Structures are given as C-alpha cells and as structure tokens.
C-alpha cells in the first residue's frame, strides 16, 4: 500500500505552512503514484532546492481563488497526468514527483472549474527535493519529451 503520515505537509520544502489557513477544507491525496510538474527551471536548481512555493507567509490560501486567478500562493501545483506537459509545452522540463500527500484539487473544489481537466494535486509548502524522482526535458516544437536527456535526481529517497 501507500504509507500515510500524520503530518499532512510532510512533503513540504517550506517549513511553517499553516495548514489551518487552507480553505475550503482540503481533501488530501492518499495514493502514492507518480505525479508531474512542468517548470521552466532546469534540474541544476530544482534537484538542489526542491520546489518551494512562491509565498507561504502571505500568499493565497483559498484553493478556489488560487485556481481562478494565478497569484503567489503557498501551493506548488502538480498533476496526475503524465502528458500535461504537452499543454504546457513551452515550459522546458517535465518533473516526475513521488511525494506523500498533497491536496487533491478536484476532490476539494469540485470537477467543473476552469482547470479541472488538469487533475491537479496542490502541495502546501511545496515539495522537498527528496521526493523528486527526476526530469525529462521537453521539445517545444514537437511537444514531446527528449527521453535521451532525462536525468535522475541524486537526492531522490524512495519511501515505498
């Protein structure tokens, strides 16, 4: 099965997320399959730092408002869909994530909002580097992964 942790923000790269300010009430992901994140930053920084959120102290904690309007927030978005990179094909990297928890966005705010088809999992306080498996770069012209240039994260620590 998947290990469950009492700390729903075990995955976070940023200490000090205030779980009680997350609204509306979060439905936490309890599975442990691979998740994906498109990002413009290459693995040199992402594997060293993990994914930190833009604004844990003063960002937008309401999940509905954060989906309606992109704005600094305590959340790092990922998706259940390996192929979401093809929509976001101008972001040069597709990161493969194996992290506990996260807020299942469609379970929390419903499945009819603007980004429901992106099947998102939002990580409050981001995702520490030990939960990032690796990356594949994305070719903008063909919208495909450059699979000969993928890279494992030296800091990935398997946990199940």
């Amino acid at each position: 099965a998947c290990p469950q942790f009492d700390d729903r923000t075990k995955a976070a790269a940023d200490r000090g997320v205030d779980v009680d300010r997350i609204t509306p009430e979060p439905v936490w992901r309890t599975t442990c399959g691979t998740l994906y994140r498109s990002d413009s930053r290459g693995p040199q920084v992402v594997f060293e730092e993990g994914f930190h959120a833009k604004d844990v102290q003063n960002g937008q904690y309401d999940v509905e408002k954060y989906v309606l309007v992109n704005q600094p927030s305590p959340y790092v978005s990922t998706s259940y869909d390996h192929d979401l990179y093809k929509t976001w094909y101008k972001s040069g990297y597709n990161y493969y994530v194996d992290a506990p928890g996260g807020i299942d966005v469609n379970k929390t705010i419903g499945d009819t909002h603007k980004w429901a088809d992106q099947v998102e999992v939002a990580f409050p306080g981001g995702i520490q580097r030990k939960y990032i498996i690796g990356v594949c770069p994305v070719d903008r012209q063909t919208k495909t992964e450059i699979m000969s240039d993928c890279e494992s994260n030296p800091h990935y620590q398997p946990w199940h």
Side-chain angles (χ1 to χ4, degrees):
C2 302
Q4 308 294 301
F5 298 97
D6 288 344
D7 178 4
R8 264 51 171 195
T9 62
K10 179 147 182 91
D14 298 295
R15 84 301 312 158
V17 192
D18 185 4
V19 168
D20 293 337
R21 287 205 284 143
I22 298 168
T23 199
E25 189 62 22
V27 180
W28 297 99
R29 161 173 164 277
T30 58
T31 52
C32 59
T34 308
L35 300 174
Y36 309 87
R37 170 168 174 77
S38 287
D39 205 292
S40 69
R41 292 171 298 166
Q44 175 201 38
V45 170
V46 171
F47 291 171
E48 173 70 12
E49 306 185 347
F51 291 118
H52 288 261
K54 287 191 194 180
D55 193 351
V56 169
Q57 295 306 319
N58 299 119
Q60 180 55 260
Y61 271 73
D62 184 281
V63 177
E64 171 174 359
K65 285 183 172 66
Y66 174 67
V67 168
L68 283 166
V69 177
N70 189 3
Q71 60 194 282
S73 82
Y75 304 115
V76 173
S77 57
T78 63
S79 177
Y80 294 106
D81 181 4
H82 169 274
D83 292 335
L84 186 59
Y85 79 88
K86 295 185 175 287
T87 295
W88 301 101
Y89 65 97
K90 298 167 173 177
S91 306
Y93 299 94
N94 193 34
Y95 287 91
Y96 289 48
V97 173
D98 176 21
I103 303 167
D104 184 310
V105 172
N106 292 359
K107 292 181 188 300
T108 297
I109 68 168
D111 67 357
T112 62
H113 65 89
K114 271 148 179 172
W115 301 115
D117 64 0
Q118 300 204 162
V119 292
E120 294 187 8
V121 180
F123 282 87
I127 301 164
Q128 59 182 292
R129 72 191 189 175
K130 68 176 61 187
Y131 298 125
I132 299 173
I133 301 159
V135 66
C136 290
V138 173
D139 181 60
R140 176 179 298 208
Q141 174 89 351
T142 60
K143 314 186 182 178
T144 61
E145 296 178 295
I146 304 170
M147 298 192 72
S148 288
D149 286 359
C150 309
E151 188 67 14
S152 295
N153 173 11
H155 304 296
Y156 176 46
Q157 180 197 324
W159 57 282
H160 57 88

